[PDB]
Amino acid sequence: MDFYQLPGSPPCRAVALTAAALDIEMNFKQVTIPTIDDNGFRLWESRAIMTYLADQYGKNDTLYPKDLKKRAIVNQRLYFDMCSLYKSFMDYYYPIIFMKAVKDQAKYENIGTALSFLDKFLEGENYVAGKNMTLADLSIVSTVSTLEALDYDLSKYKNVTRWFAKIKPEIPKYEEYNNAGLKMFKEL
Amino acid sequence: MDFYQLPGSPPCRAVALTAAALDIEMNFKQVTIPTIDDNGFRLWESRAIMTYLADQYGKNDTLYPKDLKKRAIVNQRLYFDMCSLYKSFMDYYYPIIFMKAVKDQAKYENIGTALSFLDKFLEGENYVAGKNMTLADLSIVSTVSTLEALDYDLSKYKNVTRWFAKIKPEIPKYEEYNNAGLKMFKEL
Numbered sequence: 001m002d003f004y005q006l007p008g009s010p011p012c013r014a015v016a017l018t019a020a021a022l023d024i025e026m027n028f029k030q031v032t033i034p035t036i037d038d039n040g041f042r043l044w045e046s047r048a049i050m051t052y053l054a055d056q057y058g059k060n061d062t063l064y065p066k067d068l069k070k071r072a073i074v075n076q077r078l079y080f081d082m083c084s085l086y087k088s089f090m091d092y093y094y095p096i097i098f099m100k101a102v103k104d105q106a107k108y109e110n111i112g113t114a115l116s117f118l119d120k121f122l123e124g125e126n127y128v129a130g131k132n133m134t135l136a137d138l139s140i141v142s143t144v145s146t147l148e149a150l151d152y153d154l155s156k157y158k159n160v161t162r163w164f165a166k167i168k169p170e171i172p173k174y175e176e177y178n179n180a181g182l183k184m185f186k187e188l
Numbered sequence: 189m190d191f192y193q194l195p196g197s198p199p200c201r202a203v204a205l206t207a208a209a210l211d212i213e214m215n216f217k218q219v220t221i222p223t224i225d226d227n228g229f230r231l232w233e234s235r236a237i238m239t240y241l242a243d244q245y246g247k248n249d250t251l252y253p254k255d256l257k258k259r260a261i262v263n264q265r266l267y268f269d270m271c272s273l274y275k276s277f278m279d280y281y282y283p284i285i286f287m288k289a290v291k292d293q294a295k296y297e298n299i300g301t302a303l304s305f306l307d308k309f310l311e312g313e314n315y316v317a318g319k320n321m322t323l324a325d326l327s328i329v330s331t332v333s334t335l336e337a338l339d340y341d342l343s344k345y346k347n348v349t350r351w352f353a354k355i356k357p358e359i360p361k362y363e364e365y366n367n368a369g370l371k372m373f374k375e376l
Contacts, residue, residue: 044264
């Protein structure tokens with residue numbers, strides 16, 4: 001399988017973490033990313049890639065439970081991550097980081113709103129979407145760790161901070177496949 | 189199953205169309221909508237609801253194929269619909285419809301960009317995400333029909349126009365569960 005990616009890209013790191021958690025080797029290509037080419041099957045949309053890889057190559061279904069109710073909750077969190085959390089991170093930081101535009105306080109507050117929802121999801125919970133670490137944890141951590149790298153303060157979100165701190169040690173190859181690619185953000 | 193909804197809401201109509209296509213009766217409640225309460229299982233996020241209902245109550249898997257590659261394409265289109273198509277429709281029309289704010293040309297053009305992607309997906313294709321009508325068709329039609337109801341011109345998007353015209357007759361109970369709720373938009 002070929003993996004077309006960009007080391008800093010949060011969606012790319014979500015896929016890379018997923019491949020690491022499933023112990024899947026991918027041929028990493030550098031250049032809509034990420035895209036995988038799985039023996040001729042081309043697939044884009046990070047989260048669709050993640051759920052495809054889990055079902056097609058997951059030894060057990062802990063990351064993406066076959067049980068339909070548990071799966072629906074993972075799916076619900078993946079939509080939230082993509083449409084609210086990740087989108088709001090992009091909408092505020094990307095113009096600042098790349099276009100050196102002026103900070104937008106309204107877009108900045110959308111980040112806070114998304115995190116408050118995430119913080120509520122994690123109340124009384126070890127993981128974002130069920131009793132075990134799921135794909136939703138790997139997806140969301142790719143954005144949350146990028147916020148921290150950009151010096152967003154998460155301590156107010158004590159469930160987010162709690163979850164983030166305990167999840168990094170559980171994630172296979174977290175340092176190699178997420179932490180490393182964060183260097184571009186820590187330098188700007 | 190209880191279905192908490194609002195007749196005009198596009199995500200509510202996407203779920204209602206899904207229930208109609210699967211021949212599922214739901215107890216419709218009026219008030220994050222839509223939400224279903226399936227014998228104590230509460231679930232929000234329209235698209236997560238749609239894929240839950242298809243697997244849990246679908247007689248065959250034509251609407252949401254079990255085949256992992258075909259399923260991944262449906263999933264990819266559902267993310268696009270939610271994050272690009274539906275989001276851009278909301279971002280431009282809702283301030284105009286509800287807050288009577290001034291038209292935003294940038295937000296208006298995002299609609300056009302989303303539709304151009306949809307139009308490309310439908311090139312040479314009968315359906316948005318595979319050889320048969322899938323959940324992605326029901327999701328996207330709930331937004332496309334709302335655009336038309338708001339007098340957005342889709343004729344430029346000749347694949348979108350072609351698909352929309354042939355899909356309305358195929359959708360079980362399309363008139364009752366989507367067309368009817370569109371009346372609020374045609375009057376404003």
